[PDB]
Amino acid sequence: GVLKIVKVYLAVKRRIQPGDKMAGRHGNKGVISKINPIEDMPYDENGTPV
């Protein structure tokens, strides 16, 4: 019954965003709640932000 077929592959690049699920190896889990600007994150004495 099928005359012909065309398959099309799309490659979609999905960036991390609020609501994806992230986890550790020890059973700690969570939903990414908010993406803050670099400035807001706490920073060490040296100035590297977490």
């Binding site: 960036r15 400035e39 920073y43 590297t48």
Partner: protein
């Protein structure tokens, strides 16, 4: 009754790393200026970054060239880091053309007058074949902050050429910023402090101009803020 901070010696330890000191700061404004400057510096410093790339024989990021080892996607990722200082124009089109076996670094870029390649040793790709030759056109814009590929589509403006390869623009040269308030005991005075701002950048913005530009932006916002028209 107050004093004011004047820019005193501004040492450069490395080409990227610089410490800028402000000596005559009244008690209490050490932290205020440290933090305000840190914030503006990290957020708003205008910088240059690669916006788009066209390589000839490549339709999409996922294909592969003969005689190269990195994937097209990896070449894009490598170009994202290219640190370039453009003086006059906002949009430059650099042309990279190399053949033969060897690591194609940024130095091979065709040197234009207005463009300075901060670290010519930066690697881009590795050829592996005597006759393998890559030609490409990198379009670099000026901009502030962070704009991804997907948002910039708003200004599509007939993106018809399938050869055009959009790259996420991290339009920001300041990498790291810390400040230290230390008592600057001057032989005739009671309570004054020194600000030491240590800043690490990709080697595009010079320290003095960075600090000045931050002070400018903060001053403009405070200008608007002081007057109150209810």
């Amino acid at each position: 009754e107050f004093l004011k901070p004047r820019l005193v010696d501004i040492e450069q330890v490395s080409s990227t790393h610089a410490k800028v000191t402000l000596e005559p700061l009244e008690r209490g404004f050490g932290h205020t200026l440290g933090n305000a400057l840190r914030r503006i510096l990290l957020s708003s410093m205008p910088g240059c970054a690669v916006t788009e790339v066209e390589i000839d024989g490549v339709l999409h990021e996922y294909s592969t060239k003969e005689g190269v080892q990195e994937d097209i996607l990896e070449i894009l990722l490598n170009l994202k880091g290219l640190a370039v200082r453009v003086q006059g124009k906002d949009e430059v089109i650099l042309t990279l053309n190399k053949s033969g076996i060897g690591p194609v670094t940024a130095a091979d870029i065709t040197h234009d007058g207005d463009v300075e390649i901060v670290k010519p040793q930066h690697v881009i790709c590795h050829l592996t074949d005597e006759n393998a030759s890559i030609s490409m056109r990198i379009k670099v814009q000026r901009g502030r902050g962070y704009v991804p590929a997907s948002t910039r589509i708003h200004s599509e403006e007939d993106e018809r050429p399938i050869g055009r390869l959009l790259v996420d623009a991290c339009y920001s040269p300041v990498e790291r910023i810390a400040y230290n308030v230390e008592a600057a005991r001057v032989e005739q005075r009671t309570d004054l402090d020194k600000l030491v701002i240590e800043m690490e950048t990709n080697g595009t913005i010079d320290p003095e101009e960075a600090i000045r530009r931050a002070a400018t932006i903060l001053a403009e916002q405070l200008e608007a803020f002081v007057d109150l028209r209810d």
